[PDB]
């Protein structure tokens with residue numbers, strides 16, 4: 001039973017479901033046409049993406065879907081986060097309607113350009129955009145907890161959009177006290193079972209590595225089983241080849257063992273701004 005939310009509710013007869021978009025990254029998402037969802041163009045049929053439950057969905061899946069939609073209402077609108085457009089919550093299956101990103105997730109996008117070839121400027125721009133996204137998320141008192149290139153969507157205009165809020169939480173001003181991907185987790189998350197914005201900053205470092213390796217798998221050659229021990233010993237990833245010394249030092253800063261010694265997203269945005277405008 002779902003309470004009605006009139007300002008977000010979209011009519012079912014104005015939604016036409018189409019091609020499935022894949023299953024392993026954001027749950028079951030389907031391409032769709034939504035008539036008059038864009039109020040700037042009230043006549044226009046708009047291409048959208050729709051998240052829904054699969055026939056084999058669990059109670060947790062239903063719970064998570066509702067929760068994720070509510071999260072999207074709380075965080076609000078920002079250029080570098082995926083936009084909620086509407087929802088069908090009454091008299092039928094739960095459909096959550098989000099912005100359509102024609103170029104897929106960042107990991108596949110970058111791997112595919114290992115056919116518009118990535119310049120150095122592009123990789124920095126990509127990095128800036130995501131930092132801006134995270135600066136906003138953190139400013140809304142939201143921790144993401146699953147920041148990876150697989151969870152980033154790319155629009156037609158190559159706009160980076162942070163997505164997948166399945167593990168995202170709204171916290172207070174104090175630390176949030178194993179469903180997180182290990183190779184992306186901060187030590188304090190892995191060992192101490194706490195999460196702050198500075199844990200997201202760690203993850204951002206791993207994302208940075210992903211971007212500059214054009215969609216590489218982190219800690220290459222190293223199984224997840226063995227990463228527990230190596231983190232305790234203070235292992236850090238080597239420098240990517242497409243990466244300047246400057247940008248790798250930013251990477252390494254994000255991978256400081258002491259969370260409060262890592263930069264904030266605000267600082268990351270300022271530094272990347274500088275780097276971007278010079279090159």
Ligand SMILES: */C=C\C(=O)N1CC[C@H](n2nc(C#Cc3cc(OC)cc(OC)c3)c3c(N)ncnc32)C1
Pocket residue numbers: 021022023024025026027029049050051068069072082096098099100101102103104105150153162163164165
């Ligand atoms: C790992 C590959 C994979 O599964 N995909 C590649 C790109 C495909 N795709 N997913 C989305 C999405 C989404 C989405 C839905 C939400 O509903 C609550 C919430 C999100 O973050 C909060 C993200 C997608 C979109 N939106 N456009 C184009 N392709 C898309 C799946």
